[PDB]
Structure formats: C-alpha cells, structure tokens
Scaffold this active site. Sequence first.
Site, PDB file in Angstrom:
ATOM      1  N   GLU A   1      51.502  34.618  19.751  1.00 49.96           N
ATOM      2  CA  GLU A   1      52.891  34.850  20.138  1.00 49.96           C
ATOM      3  C   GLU A   1      52.974  35.377  21.564  1.00 49.96           C
ATOM      4  OE1 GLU A   1      55.900  34.660  18.114  1.00 49.96           O
ATOM      5  OE2 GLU A   1      54.714  33.442  16.726  1.00 49.96           O
TER       6      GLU A   1
ATOM      7  N   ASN B   1      42.284  56.175  32.503  1.00 49.00           N
ATOM      8  CA  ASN B   1      41.679  55.503  31.358  1.00 49.00           C
ATOM      9  C   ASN B   1      42.486  55.744  30.089  1.00 49.00           C
ATOM     10  OD1 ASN B   1      39.602  54.630  33.050  1.00 49.00           O
ATOM     11  ND2 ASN B   1      38.302  56.395  32.563  1.00 49.00           N
TER      12      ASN B   1
ATOM     13  N   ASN C   1      46.048  50.983  40.394  1.00 50.88           N
ATOM     14  CA  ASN C   1      45.610  52.368  40.255  1.00 50.88           C
ATOM     15  C   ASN C   1      46.566  53.333  40.943  1.00 50.88           C
ATOM     16  OD1 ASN C   1      42.564  52.020  39.143  1.00 50.88           O
ATOM     17  ND2 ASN C   1      43.018  50.424  40.655  1.00 50.88           N
TER      18      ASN C   1
ATOM     19  N   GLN D   1      31.662  49.739  35.852  1.00 51.01           N
ATOM     20  CA  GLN D   1      31.777  51.172  35.603  1.00 51.01           C
ATOM     21  C   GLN D   1      33.176  51.534  35.117  1.00 51.01           C
ATOM     22  OE1 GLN D   1      30.924  53.604  39.023  1.00 51.01           O
ATOM     23  NE2 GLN D   1      31.696  55.483  38.062  1.00 51.01           N
TER      24      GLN D   1
ATOM     25  N   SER E   1      37.277  46.012  36.130  1.00 50.14           N
ATOM     26  CA  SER E   1      38.127  46.274  37.284  1.00 50.14           C
ATOM     27  C   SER E   1      37.849  45.258  38.384  1.00 50.14           C
ATOM     28  CB  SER E   1      37.898  47.692  37.804  1.00 50.14           C
ATOM     29  OG  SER E   1      36.612  47.820  38.388  1.00 50.14           O
TER      30      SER E   1
END
EC number: 3.6.5.-
Lengths: 440, 414, 453, 85
Positions: free
Chosen positions: A255, A229, A207, A11, A141
């Site tokens: 790189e 977000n 978070n 989600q 997540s």
Amino acid sequence: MREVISINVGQAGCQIGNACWELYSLEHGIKPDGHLEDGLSKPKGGEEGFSTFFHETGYGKFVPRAIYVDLEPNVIDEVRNGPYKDLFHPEQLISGKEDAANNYARGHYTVGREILGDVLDRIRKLADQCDGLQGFLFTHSLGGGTGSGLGSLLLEELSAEYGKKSKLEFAVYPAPQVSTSVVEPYNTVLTTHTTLEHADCTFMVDNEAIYDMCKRNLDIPRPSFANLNNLIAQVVSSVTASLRFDGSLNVDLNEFQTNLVPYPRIHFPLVSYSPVLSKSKAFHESNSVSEITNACFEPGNQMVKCDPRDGKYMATCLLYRGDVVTRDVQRAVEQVKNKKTVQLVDWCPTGFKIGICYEPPTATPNSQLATVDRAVCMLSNTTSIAEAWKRIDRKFDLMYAKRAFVHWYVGEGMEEGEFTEAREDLAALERDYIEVGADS
Amino acid sequence: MREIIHISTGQCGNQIGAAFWETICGEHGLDFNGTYHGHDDIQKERLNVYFNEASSGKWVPRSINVDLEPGTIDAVRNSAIGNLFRPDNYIFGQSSAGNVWAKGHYTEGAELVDSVMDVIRREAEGCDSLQGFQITHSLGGGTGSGMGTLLISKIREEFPDRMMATFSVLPSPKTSDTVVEPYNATLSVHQLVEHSDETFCIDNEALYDICQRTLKLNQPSYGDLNNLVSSVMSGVTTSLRYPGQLNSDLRKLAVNLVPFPRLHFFMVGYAPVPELTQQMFDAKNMMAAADPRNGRYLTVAAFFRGKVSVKEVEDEMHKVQSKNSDYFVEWIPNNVQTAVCSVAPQGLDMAATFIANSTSIQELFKRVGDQFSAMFKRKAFLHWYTSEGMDELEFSEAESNMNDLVSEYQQYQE
Amino acid sequence: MGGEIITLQAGQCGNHVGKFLWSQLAKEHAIGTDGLSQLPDSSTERDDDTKPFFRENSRNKFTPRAIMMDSEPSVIADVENTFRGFFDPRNTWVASDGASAGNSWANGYDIGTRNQDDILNKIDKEIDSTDNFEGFQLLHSVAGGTGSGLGSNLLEALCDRYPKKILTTYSVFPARSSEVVVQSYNTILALRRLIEDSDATVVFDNASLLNISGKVFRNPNIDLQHTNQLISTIISSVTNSIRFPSYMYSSMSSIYSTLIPSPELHFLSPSFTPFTSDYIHDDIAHKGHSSYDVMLDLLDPSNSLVSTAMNNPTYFNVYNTIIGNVEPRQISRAMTKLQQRIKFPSWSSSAMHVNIGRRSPYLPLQPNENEVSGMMLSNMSTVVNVFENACNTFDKVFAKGAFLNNYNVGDLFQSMQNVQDEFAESREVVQSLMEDYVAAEQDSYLDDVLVDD
Amino acid sequence: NYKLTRVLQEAVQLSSLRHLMNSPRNSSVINGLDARVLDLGHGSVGWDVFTLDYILYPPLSLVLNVNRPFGRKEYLRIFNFLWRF
Ligand SMILES: Nc1nc2c(ncn2[C@@H]2O[C@H](COP(=O)(O)OP(=O)(O)OP(=O)(O)O)[C@@H](O)[C@H]2O)c(=O)[nH]1
C-alpha cells in the site's frame, strides 16, 4: 510476505538499527532475555508482531533479523558488548578489520564485493529458516560512502537474486550547509545513480533538520547522535505500525508502494512526524487533530532543509497511531484542501492516504517526545526534493570544476567518466522531476 | 429458487458480511452457537435458505469470506456471531496486492481462485435451490476491487443463470486516500458491467453524510455504516423471504427494475407513509448518492415492510408522479414497482426501501473518468502497471466503454 | 450577530492590562491562574459564554483567545511564570530583537513592519483555530512609543487584511508626561492611524485613574498594577454584555451601533461607580446607594476615567449597563431625573440608553449597599481638550524640530524633511478631526442636509 | 426548504444554547420544536413566506398552550409582530 529483512550498513546505519531494535523492544516491553518477553502476550509477539522483524526460534526466543555489516572493528565491538548481539545471532553479523576508504572509493569497489557473496548466502540461509518475505529494509547514511557503497552493492545483489520483493532503503542526508567530509557530496551523487537502478523506494532524512527539531521542539541545549537515532527509530516504527500491531485500518507495505511511487521514475517520499514537542510542553499543552495535521506541513516536521510551501503537492500518506477515527482527520483534510497550504495539482490532489493503527506512540526515555494518545506520520511526495537535489548538485558541480582529489578516485576504483555519468543522471532526474511537477 | 449464497471480500466487505449475518440472526431469531430460537416454521425455512443444518441442530451460515489478511478472519471471528465456521467455508491467502486491481486479480487472486471456485462448486452441489449471489466488497480498495471482480467473473463463467447482486462500496471523490483508488474502481467496474447483473450504489461519502445528518455522529466509523447497510440488506432480503402481500425475486428485480440489459446500477435509500416518501425522494437520505432535482428518473421502485396501506402507497405514488413528472420519463410513462410485506420489521413498526435509476450514475462515471484521464496524462502510477502487464490500450478501451454507457444513459437524456 | 473577539496585548502596559483582564475573567468564570477551569466539567450548565474569549482545547482547560506582542521579553516571561499553563506560549511574540532602542513611534512601527510576517501568521493561526469571528480588541498603550508603533502597524495590517471585521481599540493616555514632546509625537502618530483605520476607540486618561486610585484605595502610594486593574475592570464590564448575554445587548456590533453615530466620531468616555472586584473593595458597603444613586455617580464627573473639563458638554450617545438586582421603577426614576439634567442637542432627539445585565453566580455576593454596579459610556467631545494638549505642544515645539534625531531611524523615512512632512500631515488630520468634533457639537451638523438637498 | 431544515439543524452549534445542548436533558427538548414553514404569499420574500409552526405532545400539551389550528393564534401573532420588528 510477512517478513521484512532489515540491514544496517555503515556506522550511522548500525547506530540507527540499534536504536530501532531498542525502541522495538521498548514498545513490546522486551528485555534482553525474553522468551517472548515473557510469554504472556498476545499481542506483543506473537502474534505479529513480532513476526515481521524478529525471527521465531524453537525455544521461543525472538531473534531480530539484522545483518550488521561494517569494516570498522570499533563499531562492531561496540554493538557486540551490548545485549543486542545476544538478541541477534553471532553468525548474522559481519566483521571487518580494515575500513574500506574515505569514503566511496573502496566501499563500492571489488574489495567490498568480496563479502557480497558471504552476506548473500547469509540472507539465503536466513530466508530459509523463516517463511515468507515482504521486502528488504536498508539503513545506511548517504554521508558515509562506505555505508552507501556497501548498501548499494547489497541492493544490486538482492535485485539480481530475488527481484520479487520491493527494496526499501532508508537514507540519511547530510547537512546542505556544512559538510564535514570533503568527498561527502561525491559519495551521495555517485550513490543516487545506484539507488536509482536498484531501489524501488527511498527515504530522505536530513541531519540538520532533525537537530533543529530537538533544539526547538524538544528544547534541549546539546543535540546528540543518540537523539537522532531515537527519532529515526520512531519514524521507522511508525511506518510499520500496522505490520507490527493490528489496527482498524491496517495498511500494507505494498500500500505504501502504490502511494509513494507515483510515476515511471519517482521513488522519493518525504517523511514527517507530528506532533513532536517537549515532554513538559506535552503535559502543559493539548492541541487538536486539526492543529497536528497542519503541523505536518511545517518546514520543521518535514525533516528536510527546504521550504515545502514552494513545493508542489503529490500523492502522500498519513499513518495514525492510538485511537484515531475518520472525521477528525477527514475534517482536517477537509480544511487542508480549503486552506491550500501546498500548491495542489490536477493529477495527485486526491491523494491524502489515511492509515489507522491501534498501537499508541511510545516516548523514549533518552529523547523527549510529545506524549499524545495519537500520532501522525505523513509520507509526502512534495516537489521540494528537487530543490534539495539542485542544492547539493550546485555544490557538486562547483566542486567538480577542480575537485582537488580526482587522482585518488581514478586510481583506486573509479574514473572521471563515472562522475560525469552520475552528474548527467542526477541532472536528468531533476529535469524529469521539474517536468512532472510543473506540468499541472 | 429461494436459497441465496453470500460472498464477502475486501477490507470492508468482511465486516459487511459479518454485520449481514448478525442482522439476519437478529431478525429471525438465533444464537451465535447455532441453537434455533425462532418461532415457528418460517424461521426454520430461512435457516435452510441461508445457514446449514449441522449435527445436533447446529446452524452455520453459507458464507464465503475471502481476503488477503489473517487479521480480517480473526476480527470476524472475534465478532459476536462469528465463532463457528467450517474451515472450508473461508479461505484466506497471503499476503497483499497493495491497492491495485491489476495485481489483485492477476497474482494475489489467481493463486486462491481455484480453491475458492472448488469451495463454491461444492456449495452449489450441496445447495439445490440457490438463486442469487450477494457479493460484499469495497470498490475503493484495489485488493478487494480485484478479488471481488475476479470472483464475480468466475461465478458468471460458471453459473451464468444464477443472479449476481453486488453491494460494492463505491469510492468517494472527497475521500482522498489514494489516487489509484478510483482508477482501480473504474477498472473493476469496466469488467463488472459484463460480469454482474445487479449492483447497488454505496458511496463512502454518502454513508458519512447520512450518518452525520441522522445519528449526528461526530466521527463516522465503518461499524455503524455497515450496521445500517446490513439493516437495509436484511429488509431487501426479507422482502423476498418473509411472507407478504407481494414478494419480489431477484429475477423479478432483473426483469422489472431496468429497461435495457446494459444498465445494472441501482441507487438505494432507506427509511426511516408521506414522511417515508419524502425521505425517499429527498437527497439527504440516499446512499448513492444522487440528486433528485439534478438526475432524471428513468425508473423507480419502493418496497415496504410492516402494516402499510396499498391505497396510501398508491396515493403517494400518484402525488409524487404528478409533482415530479419532469424527472419521471414519459416513455414508461408511469414507473411503479411496489412490494408489501405484512411482517413487522425488527424494532420498527414499519420500514421502507427505495431503488431508483437516475442520470447521476453517468455523472459519477464522468467524474471518475476525468479523474483517470487527468491523472494518467502525466503517466502517473504507470510503471507499476506496465511491470504487472496491463496496457494503456486496455485503459482507453475501458474509458470508451464507460463513455458508451454514459451515452446509453443520455439516450435517454437528462 | 455575536462573534468571538481576540485580544491583542501590545507593549508593557498593554501586556499588563491583558494579564489583569484574563485574571479577572478567570476569577469570574472560576478558571484560576492554572488554565484548568476550577469548575468541574460535569456541570456543563453555564449561564455565561467563555467561547468568545476562551478556546476550549480540553474539557477542563480554557485557553484565552489572546496574543501578546512586545519587544521586552521580561514582562512576557513574568506573565508566563505567574500564569502557569494559563496563557499559550505560542501566542507570545518578542522577535528576539532585544530591548526597545528608545520610546519612538518610528522604532515601534519599524519593529512591527520587520516582523509583520510572524504576527500575521499567528493571527491567521488563531483565526483558523476558531470558526465565528467578529473583530479584535487592540491595546495601544500610546504612552509608550514602541507599543504605540506596534499598535499602529497592527491596525494598518488588520484594516486591509480583514475589512469585514469591526475593530475596537483602547488608548491609555498618561496624566503627566516625562518626555512631553516624544510622548505627544507618539500619541498623535497613533491617533492618525486611529482616525484612518480604527472603527471604535476608547480613551483612558491616567489623571482620573490616579484620582480614583487615591480616593477609593487606602494606600497613598499608587502602583501601576492596581492602576491598570481599573482599566481591567472596565474592559470586563464592557465585555460582560457578551460574556453573560443579556436580553437587549448580546453583540459587540450591537453595542457599538448605538455608540458610533458616524465613522468620524469614534471616541468615547467611560465612567464607573466605586468598584467592588479590586484589591481594596471593603469600603463599599458604607455608602448605602441604590440604582438611582449609581446612575448619579455614573453621570458625575468624579467617577469618569478621563479628564472631564465639563464646560457645557455636548452629548451625542450616552449608554449605561447596570449589573446586579436592578429595579425598573428606579431605572425610570433615574431616567426622568437625568433627562432634565443632561444637556441634549436640539437637532437629535435621541435619549440615553439603559441596559440591565446579569451578575456572575460564582462571584462573591456583595451586601445590599453595593450589590449593584454600573458602567457608562458617553460620546462626549471633551476628549478634544486632551488632544489639544498634545496639539498645542506640537504647535509650540514643531517650530524648531526638537528630538528629530530619534524618529529618523527605523522608519521608512531617513531624511528630516520627510519626517517633518509626515508630522505636519498628522497634525493636519488631527486638526480636521477636532474641527469635525466641534462642528458636530453644533446644530449645523444636522442643518447641512436641510440647507443643501 | 429541506436544505433549509438541514442548515437549521447545522446552526445548533452557532446558537447560543450550546451549554444546554451539551447536557442530555435539553436533548430532544430542543428537538421537540418542529421545523415547519407555512407558505404565506405567492412569490413573496423569504422573510414573509417563513412561518414557525409548533406542535405539542402529551403530557406537555395538556398544560402548555401553543399555536393550535383551532385557537386564536396568540403566539402566532406575537411572533409575527416580533418578526416584523
Ligand atoms: N498607568 C500605567 N501606565 C503604564 C503602565 N505600564 C506602562 N505604562 C506607561 O508606559 C510608560 C513608560 O514606558 P514603558 O512602560 O517602558 O513603555 P515602552 O517604552 O513603549 O516599552 P514597552 O512597553 O516594553 O514597549 C509610562 O509613561 C506609562 O504611562 C501601567 O501598568 N500603568
């Protein structure tokens, strides 16, 4: 190696991708219809970008290559009503009617492996339509075991399918202070071993540290998941700014592989963004580049819930947007080495990578951002990660003594041996991290 | 043997070669469309040497620009004199090696080395009087340091008689971009010492210092640095091409600039007669960059363009020898190599180039070797190279060869 | 030897004085209250030098090199509102500790030591943002206990953090004290740290300030803002020698060299003619005075900023700075007239010093009557009487130990005996300072070396 | 003394003439001053061996007077006196 396949799992990963595609459309000024949007530029796509994430069609409509995988029909219905589904292809998205489990039990079980073959041919068909491939981008997540389990399953299948491109994985870490899910530390520890064997590079973002940034820098009273977000979208857009827009010093994805993965087993780079402040404060205050480079070392910009001063310095990267020349960031690192903020080593110290990008940073209308012609995105490898590793491990070991829930995990798809192996593996990574950090 | 081929690669060698062609056209007189504008015959000779006479009096430079980026060729085309180029003269691959010399000369370079060697073979078949190959790349970036090294090795294996002059941009110890940068640089030079014949020390920090001191440039971009190196290269190539009192060939430089064939590195300096000599023997004007009071002069050379007096240059050489006989070694015993061009430089009344061989290249080698050792003691960045195929025994052999070169440069004490 | 000076506003009075000083500097250099310089950036030819006091972040914006630190956020918020974008929001320190729990030097020192990390980090950031530094200018405002404690903590940190920097301090003394005992305790505790660590100290007694504010102004009611405006103008005048560099004095160290003959004697007395940059400055062109009359007014006790109490005052170092169209013949005449009227000690043959500065080209030009102003700084031992006021207050109240239940909390000593011993040591050190002053007032202060070699 | 000339070139920022240096008018006007040091003494102190040499150029040499090698060294002796002070 001109295309990067991005996958949104879980989600939170699906919401992160939507804000990522939205900001990607905002930077190029892309509307739901487009045709490019419209076809007049040069350099908004084509040429690259968009030629790394958006698939070019015969008509010219750029289709963002994204595979939204989830077992919750609510999130899938939410992403389909918006114009994003019209941008993507109806066959690229995968739908699930019943959620796997709470949260890692069925997310990594064989039930979640039934669709593994379905998404595998979808990626093969997607790779057959386009040409070239630079790497696999993952957005899931670590708090949600379903997204972590399915993300690890897709990572393992892609490793055994091609094994030729570096697998990138953007992981979201929960707040070490308060955890809403009781099995959240269990899903993370069990996934750390999976991403160890599969991923070549990871991304650790907290978070709580983001919420502290919006409350202090952006000065907002009520944080929101959409604000997190948007900040992640600005982070992901910054690391690929050279792949999307040409600059004076174009940096490549490899790189980053040759800078952020500096040891036999070290694939954990820390990301930091500066300057980040309110839009009003950006109009009132105007700092210098030396002030911004020092701000990347602050605990707030590091996006982690640990002090970077106690950490030991390792090879890092610093990408710059807009108009940036060498000395003002060199004289910054000239003084940064003279200040000795983070404790240096004898192996890494000459590892402040400088990357310039012509594309200036863009500020989303939803989340405030310091309006500045030049931004700094520092990808560090400081040794504060083990402090966050040991922090979540102590709560993991304290819980694992009784853990109050072992009967559900050992019955569905797991066992007590897998939990012990993931614990010994995590303890092995922390011990190797301290040895490779304190050897200087 | 007056014609010279030019090869450009790396993230900065492309712009280096672009500025080289720009300054060559600015020196002899030519439009970016190939229209001849020089007067009268020496310019046509230089065009036959470096460019190609196409149809309708068109002139396209003989350059092999190779890199792992289409943006690089796009930029060198959008440059002023960058429009017309034969599609066979430049071949670019996909997509990147990622600042790793091993991957760069093993995978990203091997897939296009066949095409670039076919191109250079056709160019050598079309060019009868080719003498030297001017390589322009950056030893800092691993991709360029691998591609240019592979190309130099292949050209050495193909035409061992043709001279090989490289202008590789050496990495700087203060420029702290990637820890793998000096490691790829030393792995490249470990093969370049045998694959090339002449190399010119060009340091990024040296360029930064020489522009911040003279131009007072608050921010050194690669543009003006490449412009200055291009002026230097135009001077040192006109020392051979343009008429003068004494012309110096690449073979002449090889047989007069170095006592023993193992040494191939040369420190360069540009100016802007007594003030020019002071600038040449000062530290703030060198691009290596070495210290004259620290390093011991093994051999030196000074070339001049414009109206310069041989009596004045001889008096200056005698005075500088009498005042710095401590750095000047006693087994030469008096080092001197002077070339004079009667033609006047572009936009300047007189110009001067200086080449030296001191005991600071070995000090830079010691620095980069200590970096490599105190970086790979903790096995830093070794899983990538073990997956690629390189070996710790090969790394130790490279370091031992560098230490042997250091002993050869201390033989020969400082 | 000229370096940048960072301003330290402490307490409510210190914050008001700093705000007034920055507004005066903005009015002088045409900067305004918005932070953006009123002068165009194309006119780079500036006779002054805002670099020692204004950090130039952007081409048109000049952020003052100042830090405000206070326990009351109301005054800081008011200053930030009345100066939109002028001040730096990151240089404002409140610690979110709420209002001051009393007016005690103990509470001030406690609130300083608790958040010493934040203010020290801000000072380190301000030092890193600049290159050339010379020293700080601290505003004690010893009338307030919390401000005095904060200033004492700042001094006790700076003395051992940057010993190679010269420290100047401005201590504002009240005219009449409401809580005489508490205010005297705070002032003596601050003077202890002043003697211990401070290099230069300038006193400002409120009695002469109120006298001048009642004399030169038309309104009988006196307000704290235009009361602090006087100290604002004084600080502007004493910093003019660095802002508009003259041909004799161009550094704070060079100014203080001729003013501090010994680290023991580090207390000065200021004096100024009727000002011209204050609110009610229209009654200045009716005096018809020259530079000689300006020097006479500077040497007159009615124009001093502290209680003179001149009973044959012994002068050690008298210095004056004259701003405007000054005449050398008139300066020579004034010097000849003052050398026969100022009492000078027989052991030191040093005379008074005169310096001529430059007027601001953008300030409103005054008529030929008061177009030339002057400032005087004298090393006089008359401050020992202002100190002896609080000293005898301490001697008459300390026999009982009143208000001891307020200085016991916050500080590192919670018992009564430790606070009593600290107060006794502070009384002893201020007594030794007064004894050194009254000894320097005599001729033996130079015969001591003659008698003992 | 070449590092001495370098640090002199660096000290232009610390010099109090930054407002004039910012303007292009004083550019090369500040540079017309020559950084030449005449050795005065054998192994003496740096202050004593330091010397200021100025060379003028037209059309300013035909008007202004400086420490010419064939003059009376007025500016030279004045600068030496002020240097001792
Ligand atoms: N003359 C004058 N005195 C002031 C001014 N502001 C404050 N004071 C002094 O401050 C004293 C009153 O206490 P406060 O101003 O609250 O000082 P404090 O108690 O330490 O509180 P804070 O300064 O906020 O820490 C008075 O006796 C004044 O002497 C001012 O603007 N002018």
